[PDB]
């Protein structure tokens, strides 16, 4: 239900990781030392490396491992440096001052330092990954990076495109969010040594968990108020990025299609489009979209013997789904 309650189960793993990543990034360079302390907000309690650590421990216990290997920990750090480096680079690209209230690296230190920091983390991840020496894991993660590129291309290509489908949208959500989680959880399973069936169920756990997460953040950019968000409510819409609440709304509302086609030419037209979303019941079908995603994830975990690890994995799903009531 809470965030810390979930992450306590691997709080120790997460702290070691945060320390290693602060040490590594910010490699006795003054500006990078500050930026690393800023980037890895002490504690290391972030969802993605914690998923790596929970699938790592659940599947390791299932496999007979008494400890997590060096591969599991290099993998949590790969995943975390990739995620962080991509967010820094995404804030430089498409200039963004804030990211969830906190201010970005690009804003604090400037574009030059942000690009250097993201590049450095991407380089470190490339090398860690090469030295895992697992060609299947190297391929999964290279697919995550390639999908970041695909996602940038496809996001720019579909701006204001009212004919985007829900499979198209869910692929953009994959490219953006779900791909890296799915990859990290299949890789955690892979390094634990469990079967291809459990590694595929953990790919599916991670991809449906990451799809639910993306669908629920897509919903909260309508739900949450303009101040609870660092930005106005419905800012993915103002910008041309049609998420699943809008896609569900455009299936029966034509007026919204004329509003988005004009690229919100009329004044007050974004707020008219927002209320057409809240009226269409596209938010509720997006809410159920997220619930169905999360339930495929929870059914994904049934391969795992009962434990505190997969109970925290199921609560990953449940916390996500109760972040939107």
């Amino acid at each position: 239900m809470s965030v810390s309650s979930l992450l306590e189960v691997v709080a120790d793993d997460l702290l070691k990781l945060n320390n290693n990543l602060k040490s590594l990034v910010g490699a006795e360079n003054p500006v990078l030392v500050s930026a690393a302390e800023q980037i890895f907000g002490a504690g290391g309690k972030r969802l993605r490396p914690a998923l790596v650590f929970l699938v790592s421990r659940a599947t390791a216990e299932l496999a007979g491992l008494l400890e997590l290997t060096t591969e599991h920990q290099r993998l949590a750090e790969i995943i975390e440096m990739i995620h962080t480096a991509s967010l820094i680079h995404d804030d430089v690209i498409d200039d963004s001052g804030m990211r969830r209230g906190k201010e970005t690296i690009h804003q604090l230190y400037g574009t030059r330092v942000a690009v250097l920091a993201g590049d450095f983390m991407f380089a470190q991840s490339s090398w860690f990954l090469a030295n895992l020496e697992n060609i299947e894991v190297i391929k999964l993660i290279s697919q995550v990076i390639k999908d970041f590129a695909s996602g940038e291309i496809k996001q720019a290509s579909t701006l204001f495109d009212c004919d985007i489908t829900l499979d198209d949208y869910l692929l953009k959500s994959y490219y953006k969010t779900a791909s890296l989680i799915a990859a990290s959880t299949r890789s955690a399973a892979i390094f634990s040594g469990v079967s291809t069936a459990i590694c595929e169920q953990m790919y599916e756990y991670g991809r449906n968990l990451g799809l639910s997460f993306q669908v629920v953040d897509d919903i909260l950019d309508f739900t949450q108020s303009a101040e609870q968000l660092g930005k106005p409510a419905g800012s993915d819409l103002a910008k041309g990025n049609l998420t699943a609440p809008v896609i569900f709304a455009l299936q029966d509302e034509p007026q919204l299609r004329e509003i988005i086609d004009s690229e919100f030419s009329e004044t007050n037209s974004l707020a008219t489009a927002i209320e057409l979303v809240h009226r269409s019941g596209g938010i509720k079908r997006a809410h159920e979209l997220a619930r169905e995603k999360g339930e495929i994830a929870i059914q994904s975990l049934q391969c795992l013997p009962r434990s505190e690890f997969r109970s925290t994995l199921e609560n990953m799903v449940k916390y996500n789904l109760e972040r939107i009531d």
Binding site: S157, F160, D161, C162, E263, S265
Partner: protein, 197 residues
């Protein structure tokens, strides 16, 4: 004359900041602009304008307002929201050879090599005494770098700017004419020295 003269100035004043209306416009300003345009075209000083082509419609005409808007998905496909700046739009009407050229000039930030243009040569006739019938002959994006940028979307671009159909000419003044093609589009053009093209 000053009634339609200062009304002309009023239309020029209501257009500033709307970028000729090519990337959309608030509906009240569009109603305003069409009000001024129908006021002007009710005050057409050149009746029977197709027999006065060489001395009124002949020349190089720069676009100052039209209902042609590039919004949404097409703006995105053409790169016209963040990369390419849709520059001027000219419609030289040379009546000797019965020609009608649409020059849509393009730009890009700092890219001297992308500054090109889409050329659209058409041939018109005179069907009605206030109405010409236009037909497309040639089409060109130059230089080859701009064509490289637009080529996969060439037909969409041309179709946005294609003068084919018919053009019913209303309010042809000596430095401003107003058109109304078959697609219910309004074209408000002004005089431009042919070196600007």
């Amino acid at each position: 004359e000053a009634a339609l003269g200062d009304a002309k100035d009023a239309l020029y004043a209501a257009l500033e900041g709307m970028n000729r209306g090519i990337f959309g416009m608030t509906s009240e300003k569009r109603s305003e602009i069409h009000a001024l345009v129908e006021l002007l075209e009710s005050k057409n000083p050149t009746p029977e304008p197709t027999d006065k082509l060489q001395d009124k419609v002949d020349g190089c005409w720069r676009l100052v307002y039209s209902t042609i808007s590039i919004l949404g998905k097409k703006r995105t496909k053409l790169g016209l929201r963040d990369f390419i700046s849709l520059g001027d739009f000219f419609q030289m009407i040379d009546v000797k050879e019965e020609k009608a050229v649409n020059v849509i000039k393009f730009s890009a930030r700092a890219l001297k090599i992308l500054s090109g243009q889409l050329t659209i040569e058409a041939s018109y006739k005179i069907t009605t005494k206030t109405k010409v019938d236009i037909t497309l002959d040639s089409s060109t994006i130059t230089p080859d770098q701009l064509m490289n940028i637009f080529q996969k979307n060439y037909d969409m671009l041309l179709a946005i700017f294609n003068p084919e159909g018919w053009l019913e000419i209303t309010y042809v003044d000596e430095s401003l004419r107003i058109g109304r093609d078959d697609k219910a589009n309004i074209f408000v053009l002004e005089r431009a020295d042919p070196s600007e093209v």
